[PDB]
Write a protein that binds this ligand. Sequence first.
Ligand code: CLA
Ligand code: CLA
Ligand code: CLA
Ligand code: CLA
Ligand code: CLA
Ligand code: CLA
Ligand SMILES: CC(=O)O[C@H]1CC(C)(C)C(=C=C/C(C)=C/C=C/C(C)=C/C=C/C=C(C)/C=C\C=C(/C)C(=O)C[C@@]23O[C@]2(C)C[C@@H](O)CC3(C)C)[C@](C)(O)C1
Ligand SMILES: CC(=O)O[C@H]1CC(C)(C)C(=C=C/C(C)=C/C=C\C(C)=C/C=C\C=C(C)\C=C\C=C(/C)C(=O)C[C@@]23O[C@]2(C)C[C@@H](O)CC3(C)C)[C@](C)(O)C1
Ligand SMILES: CC1=C(C#C/C(C)=C/C=C/C(C)=C/C=C/C=C(C)/C=C/C=C(C)/C=C/[C@@]23O[C@]2(C)C[C@@H](O)CC3(C)C)C(C)(C)C[C@H](O)C1
Ligand SMILES: CC1=C(/C=C/C(C)=C/C=C/C(C)=C/C=C/C=C(C)/C=C/C=C(C)/C=C/C2=C(C)CCCC2(C)C)C(C)(C)CCC1
Ligand SMILES: CC1=C(C/C=C(\C)CCC[C@H](C)CCC[C@H](C)CCCC(C)C)C(=O)c2ccccc2C1=O
Ligand code: SF4
Ligand code: SF4
Ligand code: SF4
Lengths: 185, 80, 168, 49, 732, 131, 33
Amino acid sequence: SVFDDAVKDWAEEYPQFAAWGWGPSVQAEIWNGRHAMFGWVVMCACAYAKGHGLIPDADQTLDLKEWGTLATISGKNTITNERAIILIANVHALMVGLAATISPNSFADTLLLDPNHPMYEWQMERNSKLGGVMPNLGKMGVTPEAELANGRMAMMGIITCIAYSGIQGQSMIDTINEWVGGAYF
Amino acid sequence: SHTVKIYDTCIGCTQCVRACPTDVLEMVPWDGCKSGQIASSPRVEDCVGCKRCETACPTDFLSVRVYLGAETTRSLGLAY
Amino acid sequence: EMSKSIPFLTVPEKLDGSMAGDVGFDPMGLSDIQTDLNYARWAELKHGRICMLAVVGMVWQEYGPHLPGDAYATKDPWEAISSVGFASNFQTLLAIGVVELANWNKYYGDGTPGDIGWTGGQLSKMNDAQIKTRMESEIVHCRLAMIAFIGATHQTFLLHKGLLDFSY
Amino acid sequence: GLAHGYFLIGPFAQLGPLRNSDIGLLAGFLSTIGLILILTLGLTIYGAA
Amino acid sequence: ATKFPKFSQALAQDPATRRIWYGIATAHDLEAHDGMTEENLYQKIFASHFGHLAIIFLWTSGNLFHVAWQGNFEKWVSNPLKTRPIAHSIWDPHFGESALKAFSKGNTYPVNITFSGLYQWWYTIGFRTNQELYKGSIGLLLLASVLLIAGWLHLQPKFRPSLSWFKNNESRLNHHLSGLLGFSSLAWTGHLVHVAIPASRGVHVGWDNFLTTPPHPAGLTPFFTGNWTVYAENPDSATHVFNTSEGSGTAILTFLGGFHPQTQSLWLSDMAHHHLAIAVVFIVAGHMYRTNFGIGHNMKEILDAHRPPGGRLGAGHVGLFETITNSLHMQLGLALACLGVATSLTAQHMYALTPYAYLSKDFTTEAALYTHHQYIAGFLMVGAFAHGAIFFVRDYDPELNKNNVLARMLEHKEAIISHLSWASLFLGFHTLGLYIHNDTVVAFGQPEKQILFEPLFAEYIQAASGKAVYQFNVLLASSTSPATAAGNQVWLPGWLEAINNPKTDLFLKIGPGDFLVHHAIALGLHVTALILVKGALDARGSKLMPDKKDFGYSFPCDGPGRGGTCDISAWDAFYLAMFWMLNTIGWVTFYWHWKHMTIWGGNPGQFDESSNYIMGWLRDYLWLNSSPLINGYNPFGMNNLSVWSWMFLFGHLIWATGFMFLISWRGYWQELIETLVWAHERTPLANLIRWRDKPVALSIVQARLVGLVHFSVGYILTYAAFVIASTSGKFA
Amino acid sequence: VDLDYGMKNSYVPATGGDGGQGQFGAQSPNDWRVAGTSPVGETSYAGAADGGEEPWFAEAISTVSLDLQKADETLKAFTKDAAAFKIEEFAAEKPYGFTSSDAAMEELVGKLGYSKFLEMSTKQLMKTWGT
Amino acid sequence: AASFLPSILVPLVGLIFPAFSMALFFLYVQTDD
Ligand code: CLA
Ligand code: CLA
Ligand code: CLA
Ligand code: CLA
Ligand code: CLA
Ligand code: CLA
Ligand SMILES: CC(=O)O[C@H]1CC(C)(C)C(=C=C/C(C)=C/C=C/C(C)=C/C=C/C=C(C)/C=C\C=C(/C)C(=O)C[C@@]23O[C@]2(C)C[C@@H](O)CC3(C)C)[C@](C)(O)C1
Ligand SMILES: CC(=O)O[C@H]1CC(C)(C)C(=C=C/C(C)=C/C=C\C(C)=C/C=C\C=C(C)\C=C\C=C(/C)C(=O)C[C@@]23O[C@]2(C)C[C@@H](O)CC3(C)C)[C@](C)(O)C1
Ligand SMILES: CC1=C(C#C/C(C)=C/C=C/C(C)=C/C=C/C=C(C)/C=C/C=C(C)/C=C/[C@@]23O[C@]2(C)C[C@@H](O)CC3(C)C)C(C)(C)C[C@H](O)C1
Ligand SMILES: CC1=C(/C=C/C(C)=C/C=C/C(C)=C/C=C/C=C(C)/C=C/C=C(C)/C=C/C2=C(C)CCCC2(C)C)C(C)(C)CCC1
Ligand SMILES: CC1=C(C/C=C(\C)CCC[C@H](C)CCC[C@H](C)CCCC(C)C)C(=O)c2ccccc2C1=O
Ligand code: SF4
Ligand code: SF4
Ligand code: SF4
């Protein structure tokens, strides 16, 4: 409940991973939050396209001959163009992420805390002063603080969307449209 | 590494120390046998485990016993 | 030597009167193999506290003001689960889980069995003896509730009649 | 890396499962990227040890 | 240690690749780990057992889940004899369109047909809908989690059981016999009476109505009144159609004997009565040992007092109590042995007394189950003898067991080994000789000169239980026999029908051909036993190595001297016996399959005449029935048997690869590896990368193990494909 | 010479199944697990040999050798105790006009070298030192 | 949809999982605590 104790216990139980910043850490909170914030954009875009019929030739399945069995969902049934396109968009993004993970710059925030990276100290310091229950105002604008606050907000939204969708028995895309006011559809 | 032990049944034939490929055994003074000598294993850190020594012992049951154990570069005969 | 509750049996050693509710009752000797009775006391309290709420709730739901809305009206306590739905039930379960995992160390630790800090202002400004009296009251009520729960549930599924329906 | 990546796309593109497909070259590229990832994992692990 | 084998400094400080290989294979020998106390050992073992249990339950959960989510159970339930059961779906990105169609035959998606018999078992026990199967899977997942929690809990400081608790034999036996086996059986008869039997008669009893749907019309009144006969009245008619109320009865506990006419399986009512009786027996037996209540027997006293007055068995069983309680290896050996016998019995009795509905009509499944349990039985048997030997080398106290029944066994070891040898020789020479005689004469075109002995003794036993074909008028085959009179009004009516029905596997007809194969199986058991028994007795010492006990259960050798001492350790006996175990089990399985294959095909004569000589087995069994398998994929196409075809060849590869390790030894390989090291160190560019664990050749014992594993895996895989593809390809 | 240099290694004998450090130590003090080759103008194995223009074959450049002069010293140091025992016995047997152990050693080793001295019986020594 | 799960999990179980597991074992056996 004190939070700190639980984190400590995790580190003790899984020390090797904790060393790099894995697990319940500020680093993870920041990175996972950044991804969630970014995703919201992707999900909203998908909703807009679906509603405005932008995706080309959706509701059609890729050819099992042009493409391969890798495109099969069951037997000879294949993936629809829409899902394929959405995936390719995400793959564009993932590729950028992989490059950043494997080939970091000298002034970049590395995914994991590496003692041999020049930014190790700054990262360690930033994380050391970025923990709290309530968003720290007075540090508005482009600050590490603002980033974390917004990230937590985004992650919470994801959870809420899934839950609401289930309770109302609707797709997540529908809930998004609803919360926007039905603009997308 | 390996463990080599000598027992009281030794007769000081010196055959074992003359067969070791890595000079692990020596002949030391003793009074329990007519020959007045017994075998010792001062440098077992160089035993490769060949057991040539055992093959040379003339006693009913080997007076020199080699018990294979922990392995090191020397015991594994690795020139690389 | 001889149990107070059962006058014709020898009292197990661990039952020495230190803990509240120690009337020297352990006929089957389940206390010997245990290093201490702390974990067991935690469970006794937890089981009893849940049972207390259950008995009260069952009576209320059968004969009391229900929450506004359909699906929250079935008087039958057993049917209520399905009627209310998975969503409602899941949310309660998750909440209980959080509390349980948060106090995990307490349950498996060496502190006062049964104390998770929810003491209100009670059990304060009182001598140790008074504290023990309160604790004894709780354990007595816990045990009573547990016996009652068995009876209430069994009566419901055997006699198939309301709890407060007394007809012969 | 520049040297090894250029020659690896060939084998996949001309002899892979979807070689005769119109998207064969694209598939070949993806396959090469996959192999590069595997090799990169190896390099990372070697360094650590 | 500070390296991989934390439990062994010796291996940890090793500069070669052996450190990794050995650490993996010495991980579960907790007794030999650095700094192991007996208390810790027991505690860790107890926790490990919880984990194993969890794995078993997760496995069961998966089968239910996949059958429910991707199977055809409900359709099968509707038409059991015209639908092929589905195991799981297939999603292989390497498949070609043709394959997708072939494996999707009969369905709409690629699928694997199950030969495990789960459908029949579940159908018999009461399952009728997919939702029911789902609930079961979910429940087992939860139970698995609970077991994992227990493992952690009992390793915690305040919950670790004491060493004394682990050695309270009386309480455990009483509890296990009365509760684990006895009460569980009582619970099962409850299920059968409440859920299964009602379902067979068309009534649905589930968690929704079990408390309001009485299992029997009379109620529990007859039970407490003592009029138990009521529960056996009105048995299902012979015209009863399973899973429906037409011709149904009301009986819940009966002793009809025989098989349901339509399902060709044992009556459910009889099974319920069976488990009820077994329950009482076990519950009573669980009240024999003293457990803190005064009454009971003390095992030590019982063992000590049993010494034949004549002195023929020396001091008797004195001293065995301590030996068993203080040796986990002996305990394991005893357990594995008993379980091994049980597994064989399951295989033998399950094909004759079919327990599940419509299982007899599924030929492939029936074949798989038999071969499955028989092979498991062999492994379990060999392990028992192996741990028995480990016991002698590690836990045997010569002084405690002075003139004990166990010590005297090691005194006449030569007698036992020598006589077992003679038996093996006698059986071997004559069995092979007779087979070759029959082969030669037949080859020369004179089959009338074959030496064929009728299995009269076995035929007599069959007749004794009621078989009439052999014409031996004895016991139950005699109307005037006192035995017939006794059960003629009890269970014989039904039994005598099944035993004398040619379309059942109850006491199949035997002939001269069966005589020979049985004697071959005898050879296998005897020779396998010789190897294992010798290993155990000669594990603590021999004339060649009178000090073997000081080297251990497994050591490479003792040198090239004194004549050569290769394969002199006890572990090597296990190594050598494994091959014989596989051979004998192979013979047993081949016999069952061929006999049944001919019966199913409608030509029992082929086995009867061609089983007398060896060529028959090769040509009329292995060669003839391999045609479907080898044509799974051909230059003209493929079918659903392609996977089985490929596996058959795959097995041959692994088997042969094993030979490399078995025939080629270390010296050659070590020298070759040395050359490779030189190359890597001298080749530019690659020099940049270097190893941290010196590359060395596999050890002597390691190679033996690796080879045995390759040989074994290939052996099982190849036969598995044949037994399945051949049976399915021809009769399915 | 540090006669314990070899004994001072990272090896730790196990309880059961190990002969031990023996007489000269069981393992080298240095760890063999060093790196591989390096680019021109760089070094890898600590005190490694520069490969010059052929870094690929640097490991073939020897840097560890035996000085004949130094060889003499190691022979003397490692055999010091044996020499002591030998001379002591010679002294015990009433040496003719004996002086000092060390003095006797020098005289006896001046002749008969040192190796010969180590391989001679006290009787032979006394005969030799009769003068 | 659950039907898509076979095509989303099998790639992970048979490729990603085994790889990471093997990597971890290597790092574990090549480390000197
Ligand atoms: C063992 C405890 C227990 C459980 C499992 C349930 C379960 C249920 N109750 Mg119920 N109830 C209980 C005790 C319990 N009750 C008690 C003690 C009372 C009297 C105050 C009631 C009065 C009550 C009414 C009036 C109604 C229900 C109803 C229901 C059903 C829908 C849930 C709901 O609306 O609850 C409503 C819950 C409340 C009104 C208050 C619950 C009191 C809780 C237990 C106080 C304890 C809180 C705890 C100490 C702190 C949080 C714990 C942790 C998660 C943080 C559900 C089957 C509804 C129904 O009929 O469904 C068909 C309904 O209308 N209950
Ligand atoms: C706190 C526990 C408790 C309480 C208060 C009750 C109360 C009741 N039960 Mg019940 N029951 C319980 C536990 C309990 N039960 C348990 C554990 C089970 C088994 C699972 C049952 C099974 C059960 C059945 C099967 C039936 C009842 C019935 C009844 C009702 C009539 C009982 C009766 O005729 O007794 C009469 C008592 C006697 C004839 C004996 C005299 C009592 C002795 C001699 C001394 C009593 C004094 C003692 C201190 C009690 C005080 C405690 C109490 C006042 C709080 C009554 C409302 C019956 C009914 O119709 O209710 C609807 C009924 O059919 N119960
Ligand atoms: C060892 C023999 C062998 C060969 C040559 C092939 C060849 C092929 N297989 Mg096959 N396969 C084999 C064995 C083999 N297979 C076995 C044993 C199996 C069972 C597991 C399979 C299972 C299999 C499947 C399931 C599939 C294939 C596929 C393929 C094709 C894709 C090639 C590819 O992506 O490689 C990539 C190759 C590289 C990235 C490197 C190639 C090696 C380079 C060229 C060496 C260069 C050395 C150089 C000259 C040294 C000097 C340098 C100096 C001058 C500077 C290709 C025709 C696919 C296909 O479409 O089938 C047609 C496919 O889906 N194979
Ligand atoms: C309840 C059953 C049981 C239990 C608890 C044990 C427990 C034990 N046995 Mg035992 N054993 C058993 C059954 C059992 N055994 C059976 C049935 C046999 C007969 C085969 C044996 C034969 C046996 C021998 C011969 C030896 C043991 C030993 C041991 C001890 C160490 C085990 C070890 O180091 O493994 C560590 C872990 C492993 C070895 C991993 C196993 C990997 C296997 C071999 C390969 C897997 C198959 C393959 C990969 C499948 C891939 C195929 C695919 C391509 C399709 C341990 C006390 C050893 C000992 O010295 O004890 C004193 C020993 O020498 N046992
Ligand atoms: C085809 C393969 C084959 C055959 C035939 C044998 C045969 C034999 N093995 Mg064997 N074995 C084999 C493979 C084989 N092994 C393999 C692969 C392994 C590795 C695990 C082993 C491991 C093994 C062990 C560990 C042991 C044996 C033993 C035996 C003997 C058992 C006693 C017996 O059958 O006497 C009869 C033998 C035969 C029928 C075979 C020889 C037949 C020749 C041709 C003589 C035939 C005479 C004929 C009847 C006419 C005689 C009269 C004429 C002179 C006029 C027997 C000699 C046991 C042993 O030593 O015996 C006590 C034993 O302990 N084997
Ligand atoms: C369950 C495990 C699994 C799965 C899902 C696959 C899946 C596949 N294999 Mg395969 N394979 C496996 C196990 C598996 N394999 C094993 C165990 C072996 C050894 C016998 C092989 C040997 C094998 C060969 C020899 C070949 C394949 C090929 C293929 C591809 C043919 C379908 C296609 O469209 O190709 C067309 C290819 C594409 C459309 C490209 C897809 C995008 C790639 C796969 C992205 C990979 C990135 C990945 C995340 C990197 C891994 C990182 C690491 C940390 C794990 C397909 C992706 C063929 C191929 O083309 O390989 C790519 C081929 O030649 N496999
Ligand atoms: C659309 C709209 O706005 O209209 C609304 C109007 C209206 C009328 C309000 C509606 C409603 C009904 C609603 C919203 C109902 C919500 C109901 C809800 C939320 C009901 C229970 C939670 C249960 C708990 C917490 C139970 C037990 C908790 C227990 C029993 C514990 O023992 C906790 C425990 O800690 C103890 C105490 C001791 C610890 O040692 C051990 C543990 C940790 C186990 C409608 C109709 O639906 C919609
Ligand atoms: C090595 C070994 O296994 O030894 C074990 C064996 C075994 C059996 C387990 C042991 C036990 C326990 C005991 C005491 C076993 C003895 C006997 C047993 C088995 C059980 C007891 C009493 C049954 C009674 C009193 C009958 C009630 C029956 C009655 C009251 C009735 O007849 C009702 C009925 O009459 C009406 C009213 C009208 C009739 O029209 C219908 C009938 C006739 C049915 C042992 C001896 O301790 C040790
Ligand atoms: C029980 C317990 C406790 C607790 C607790 C609690 C409440 C734990 C709960 C933790 C919780 C609930 C953590 C949520 C995470 C959500 C995440 C990470 C979302 C990631 C989302 C990402 C990375 C977004 C990805 C995508 O953008 C990508 C990738 C592609 C786009 O196409 C689409 C989207 C946008 C989806 C105590 C009380 C605190 C202490 C006690 O001791 C132990
Ligand atoms: C090594 C060793 C070991 C092991 C052993 C073993 C493994 C054994 C086995 C054994 C066995 C495996 C046995 C078997 C047996 C069998 C039997 C004993 C049978 C019998 C039979 C009878 C008795 C009869 C029956 C019948 C009846 C009932 C009636 C009529 C008919 C008839 C036939 C059927 C141990 C660990 C202990 C330790 C020590 C050493
Ligand atoms: C081929 C052969 C070898 C050599 C076989 C070897 C060296 C096997 C090498 C390949 C196996 C598959 C190990 C390769 C492991 C990989 C390098 C990955 C290891 C990763 C670690 C973390 C485990 C022997 O050492 C040997 C010894 C005694 C009798 C017969 C033989 C024999 O026949
Ligand atoms: S085993 Fe070999 S190295 Fe060791 S003492 Fe004997 S002969 Fe010498
Ligand atoms: S060979 Fe045997 S008897 Fe001869 S000296 Fe050596 S140990 Fe003694
Ligand atoms: S294992 Fe090696 S040393 Fe031992 S007897 Fe065989 S060949 Fe000789």
